[PDB]
Structure formats: C-alpha cells, structure tokens
Amino acid sequence: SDALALGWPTGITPEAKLNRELWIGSVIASFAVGAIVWGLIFWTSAFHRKKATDTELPRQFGYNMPLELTLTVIPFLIISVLFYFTVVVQERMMHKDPNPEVVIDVTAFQWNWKFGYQKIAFADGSFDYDGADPERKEAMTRTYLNFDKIETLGTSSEIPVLVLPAGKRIEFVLNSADVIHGFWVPEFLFKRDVLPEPKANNSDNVFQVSEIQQTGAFVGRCTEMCGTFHAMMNFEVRVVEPNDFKAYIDQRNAGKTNAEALAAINQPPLAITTEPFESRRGELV
C-alpha cells in the first residue's frame, strides 16, 4: 500500500485509483521476479565457490534444452497477463463520454498556463454557461488555439489556479502556443504532452476525469522540456464544491480576477501548494 506503491500519491479520480492498483500489482510482479533472480545470483555466489578441495574442472555442461524452453515460455505468460491488464486499464483511462459537464481550454505558453471554462453543463440541469469566445479566435486567422471569456492567466508573480467542482465530469482540451509542454497533476496519476497543433500532428489533446472525488488544492507541473524556466512553470488545481463552484463562476462573470473571486468564495486567494519562483537567477545575485 503506502510503501508498496513506492510513493504514488493516493488517487483522486477513479482512473487514478485503477492506475494505482495496476501499478501495485505490477510492482509486486517485478519485485517477485527480482527476488527470485537475485536469490539465484546470491545462491550461486555464496555456494558454488572454488573450494580448497576442488581439484578438477566441473561438469562441462552447456545445454539443457527442456529448461531453456520452460524459462522461455514463463516470461511470455507474465507479459501476456501484464498486457491484458495494461490494455484494460489504458482503455478505461481514455473513455471520453460525449457529454462533458465542465470543459477547460488549457493553453500553455512560454512558461505559464491559461484556463478557459469553455462550456459548463451540469448533469442535474442546474447551471449551463457557454464561455466560448469565437471573435477572439477568428481575430488571429493560430486557429488551433482556443479562447474564452473567463480566463486565468498565469504570471511570473501569480501561480494560475484552476477551480473545478467535485463529483463533476471534467474535460481538458490541451493546446500550446509555442512549443511542447507537459500537463501533469501528480494526483491524477496521469499526464499529457501539450503540443503546438495537436490535430495536425494526429495527437489526442483531449482527456476527461469522470469525477474528482475530494476537494482540495493540488500542484501541477510542466513535464516536457520547454526551455530556460521549465522548472518554474507550476500551476494549481483547486477543487471546490459544486455550489461554491457555481458561485465562483458567477463572480468571475461580473468582472472579477481569480484572487478576488477566491476571496469571495471563502478560499485562499493565491496558490498554496506551490509558490511563485524568485525571478533572481540565483542566490549569488
């Protein structure tokens, strides 16, 4: 569990839970194989050592075809079971229901992020908002990029905080203005490359979480080499309650920045799992 997962954080989405369980099982299999083979190595090194009595060279055997085929076929069975579980889990983690409940236009530019809230459609039918802004999108035709009315631009001094509800299906549409970046939230147990033009490059920049189980604050990082400040591009996902989420959206509608709306919704105004980085190139400055 805690020690056997070798450090994976407890999942916060059903896909994360399933991925973590698959990782636990795979680590069990790998460590069992390692224990067996290392026990063989230590049994051969400790015993089977040239003794003082040993006078003549041992049995000069070099071919045991039956055992060769037996240990040829065992790894095939192990990789077969691993492949079955792998394909099951990787198909589960890419389900893509055709009706999302919240849509985010994640845009990565040179060392920051920008979220969109493109289209919110609650499943209970309590809140529908259409944030798609097509005039801005057409104003620069980077047609692949997506714009929105409500945004959260990350800055050198402010970590971009994404606010989402719990128990609500969430879709992320990834776009990068300039180069490849990385969308990783270590709590989702999932990450994706944020490409310049995901469609022209035959990449699937869309992925969904069925529901974020518990609310809170979670750090996200860039996990693809992008240049100078690759380590200084973190962001944050703040999962809140659905009613608090609707209140936050309504405040953001009436011309409110992220910090002001977070303060209005009785939450910390800034990032709390990560902090902005000292612009100073080092401590010897």
Partner: protein
C-alpha cells in the same frame, strides 16, 4: 635455464608512440585509443553530472542558473551516450574481435582509423559549444522538434551539437561497416559462424543495428539544420513536424540503446565461463536471443512516445514486452553458466555479477515503464532517470570495467592490481545504489526530470541529499581505477603466459600478452567455440563432448 630481465620495460624510448598514434592502422592501438579517449569523455560527462547533483542538493539556486543547468544535463546526456558508450563499443571490438576470429587485421585498416578520428573530432565539435557565449546545447539530448527551431534555442551551441553528432555518426557507421565485413570474410580456417564467441555475434548484430539507426539520425539532423539555416518547414508544427521528429529520433534512439547494450552482454558472456570453469550455457540460445533483440529493437521506438497521444499504444507496448522476453532468456543462460561451477571473484567476475544485479533492476524498472497507463504517471519523472541509469551502469559501466580488467593483461602484458580493483568495485557499487535508488521514489511522488530548481515545500530535499552524496561517492570511485591503471601500465605485475586468467575460452588467449603484430604466430585446430580451452587442456576435450548435454 634462459636469460631475462629482472623487470620488463616501463616505458618505451622517446618518440615511440606519437607517430604511431598519428599513422597507425593497427586495430589494437586504435582500440586502446578509443578506450582512453572514451574514458576521458566519461570523466567530463561525470563532472557535468556532479555539477547538476550539487545544484540539486538543496532547493535554492546556489550557483547555477536555469540556462546553465539545462546546458549541463543536455551535454551530460549527449557525452555519456554518444562520446563514451557508442565509441567504447568499437574500442572493445577493435581490441578483441580480430583476435576472436583469428584475423591479422580488420577488413579496412585505414577506414578504422578514419572512424576513430571522426569520433574524436565530432565529439570535440559538439562539446565546443561551451566556448560560445550563449553556451552549449540547452534543449536536452533528445532534441524535441519545436524547442529546437531557429526561434526557440537560437544559439550556436545547438548547431554545433547537431553537426558534431553528424560527424560522430558517420564515424560510427564506418566502424560498423568495418566490423560486419571483418566478421563476414576474415575468419580463421576452423572458425565457423557457429564457433565464434558470443561477443563476436553481439558486435555483428550491433553493427547491423548501427547501419539501421545512425543514417536515420543523420538525415533527421540534416533536416533540422535545413530548418535552422535555410528556414525550411520540415518540422514546422503546421505539418506533422513535431511528431515527425519524435518518430525519426526514437527510431534512431532505441536502436542506439540496444547498440550500447548488446556488446557488453557479449563481454559478460565471455567473462562468465572463464571464472566459472564451465562452458557458456545455451550458446545457440544466446545467439538466437541476441538475434531476437536485434530484430525487435527496431519496431518498438514509440514506447518513448506514450505521453504524446499520437501513437498506437497496444502495438508498441506488446512489442516492448516481446523484446523484454529475450533479455530474460539471457539472464537465465548466464545463471546457468555460473550454476554448479567453481567461481573465483577476481575483479572481472565481481564486476560481471554487479552487472547482473544492476541491469536486472533496471530491466524491471523498464518493464514497469512499458505499460502505457504506468508511463502516463512516471514518464518524464526521475523514475525514468533511475531506470535508464540502472540499465546503463549494467551494460556500459560494470561490463565495461569487467572487460577492461579482463583484457588489460592481453593488451598490455601487465596485470591490474586486484586490491585496488576490489576497492574500486565496492566504491562504485555503493555510490551508484546510493545515488540512484531513491530516484524511483523521487519520481513516483512527482518530481519531473530536467528541473534546475524546486521548492522547499516540494518535499524533495532528503532524497536529493542522498542522491548527491551517492554522486560524490561515484566521483571518488574513479580515483582507484585511474590510479590503478596509471601505475599498472608501467609498474604492473608482468604476464609472461598465454591466458593469465587460466581458463580463457576464445582465441585471444591462444596468443601472447600482448599479441604480436598480426596477433598470431600460430593458430590451433579450431573445433568448437572454446578453442583455447581445448588447446591448453587437451585432456578435457572428451569430457566436454561427453558432458555437453545436461540430459
């Protein structure tokens, strides 16, 4: 009675080496030149690694900027993969392969020296990017497409990187051509294809993989240089440019890692039966497993591209599992070789056992990485770092040192001090596990790779301290080996016999130490894959025939 000298010659007279270095077509001298220059480049790469670890010891940016740290891991990875491992492969090939097949030379002795000098000068060209005010390449060794354009990373260090790689790749292709030709049509009378040792087979398949892989990298580099200088649109994201570069680069790069893996499998398969006093187990099985690895290392290139969401996950994941099977067969054969024998842990055998342990753990980590759902979490994190450092110390460090300790008497006529060898091995083992065991955990709880700086609230300080301590243990572990080689070259214990390890198997132990020019004053009657064993112990031939089959 016969006359001798109290001690052999320490050093040759003045002017005894330099014109040979400039003009030699001798494959043994050229192999020594690879060994020395590759080790120097390894020291430079390790210095870069120590700089990175010292910076990553504490969450603040003590002495490195972000630009400098990116330069450092880019050039460390480039130097360690392309200026140390790939050329040390051909250094060992030049050292022993003509000896192993009973040849007087390589097929093209001048093309061999050309390969070596192309190595040296391409490596120097790629490293000379630090001389530029902008600095060396600061975009990683993988050179992903949009980040490498004339816009992003516009300096000259990246261009020098590209062209130095092109020159080194040309050298590698020429060396591979030479090795294939030499193996095909320069063997001794008795030496049939199924009587060459495992090392020769591994160099043959490695040269085939080199021919398959390095022209792809050269073409990709030339397209990149076109886009950087002529403003071409090969890798422009408007087309499928970024995925084009990913596909081309990894079609190169996974064959590259198997190119630097297989010859050291051959080295350990040579060393094990000698210090085991047994024959290599599953000789034919090892040949077929090597062939299977060589064939399968060409269609799995996109297991490095899981996070892109633009590849067929099941195809590449299944092919990766399939390629994982033969390495398991290889471990089984090596264990069978060591099983029920008479083991003495002189330094090469000890290093080979270290290889077994380290590369086994690296292979387990790689199998874990093979599943796309698990790679969806652990890619680009220090888990990948730990995995590939484990497999790389498996192949190109523990087996490189095993081979150096084994073949030092054969190439120099002097022994290496075994006490310094044991001290060096234990320092290397402890330092390596100290510096790379905790990075699995460091990547599992998310710390991505290529980060110059992190936060005190990130929670990564203790494991990074352990890693930096281990890195400096690895740094101080190089002093025993350097001192041992430097003292043993001149004042090393003389070897006046053939096969100073007693039970050598292949033909390199049928000649003197060192072998004369053209390697052979006489050839034995070759009848199996261990001709020197049957020559030196002729009473055991009927034993080996009768007892070859276990059942």
């Amino acid at each position: 009675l016969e006359a001798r000298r109290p001690f052999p010659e320490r050093m040759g007279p003045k002017g005894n080496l330099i014109y040979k270095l400039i003009t030699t077509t001798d494959h043994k001298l050229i192999g020594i030149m690879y060994c020395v220059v590759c080790f120097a480049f390894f020291l430079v790469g390790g210095l870069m690694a120590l700089f990175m670890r010292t910076e990553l010891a504490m969450p603040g940016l003590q002495f490195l900027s972000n630009e400098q740290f990116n330069q450092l891991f880019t050039m460390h990875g480039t130097v360690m993969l392309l200026f140390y491992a790939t050329p040390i492969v051909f250094g060992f090939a030049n050292l022993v392969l003509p000896l192993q097949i009973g040849a007087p030379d390589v097929a093209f002795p001048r093309l061999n020296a050309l390969s070596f000098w192309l190595f040296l000068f391409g490596a120097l060209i790629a490293i000379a990017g630090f001389i530029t005010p902008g600095g060396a390449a600061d975009f990683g060794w993988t050179a992903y497409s949009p980040l490498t354009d004339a816009i992003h990373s516009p300096g000259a260090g990246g261009d020098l990187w590209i062209m130095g790689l092109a020159v080194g790749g040309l050298g590698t292709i020429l060396g591979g051509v030479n090795m294939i030709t030499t193996v095909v049509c320069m063997r001794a009378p008795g030496m049939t294809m199924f009587r060459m040792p495992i090392f020769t087979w591994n160099i043959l398949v490695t040269s085939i993989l080199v021919l398959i892989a390095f022209p792809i990298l050269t073409a990709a580099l030339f397209g990149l240089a076109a886009d950087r200088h002529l403003g071409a649109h090969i890798y422009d994201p408007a087309n499928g440019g970024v995925l084009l570069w990913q596909h081309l680069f990894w079609f190169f790069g996974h064959p590259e890692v198997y190119i630097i893996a297989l010859p050291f499998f051959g080295i350990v398969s040579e060393i094990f039966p000698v210090f085991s006093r047994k024959p290599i187990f599953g000789y034919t099985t090892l040949i077929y497993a090597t062939l299977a690895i060589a064939a399968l290392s060409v269609a799995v290139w996109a297991h490095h591209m899981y996070a892109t969401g633009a590849v067929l996950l099941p195809f590449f994941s299944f092919m990766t599992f399939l390629i994982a099977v033969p390495t398991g067969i290889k471990f089984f054969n090596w264990i069978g070789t060591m099983w029920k024998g008479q083991l003495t842990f002189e330094t090469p055998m000890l290093f080979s056992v270290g290889f077994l342990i380290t590369f086994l753990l690296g292979g387990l980590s790689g199998v874990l990485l093979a599943s796309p759902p698990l790679d969806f979490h652990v890619t680009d994190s220090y888990f990948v770092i730990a995995h590939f450092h484990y497999v790389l110390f498996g192949t190109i460090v523990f087996a490189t040192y095993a081979g150096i300790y084994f073949w030092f008497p054969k190439m120099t006529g002097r022994l290496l001090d075994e006490r310094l060898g044991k001290l060096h091995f234990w320092l290397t083992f402890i330092g390596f596990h100290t510096t790379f065991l905790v990075q699995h955990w460091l990547g599992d709880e998310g710390m991505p790779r290529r980060y110059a700086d992190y936060l005190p609230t990130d929670g990564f300080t203790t494991l990074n301290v352990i890693s930096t301590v281990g890195a400096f243990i690895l740094g101080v572990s190089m002093l025993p080996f350097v001192w041992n080689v430097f003292k043993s070259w001149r004042y090393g214990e003389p070897v006046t016999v053939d096969d100073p390890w007693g039970y050598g198997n292949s033909l390199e132990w049928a000649t003197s130490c060192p072998p004369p020019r053209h390697n052979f004053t006489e050839l034995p009657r070759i009848r199996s894959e261990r001709p020197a064993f049957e020559l030196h112990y002729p009473h055991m031939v009927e034993r080996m025939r009768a007892e070859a089959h276990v059942g």
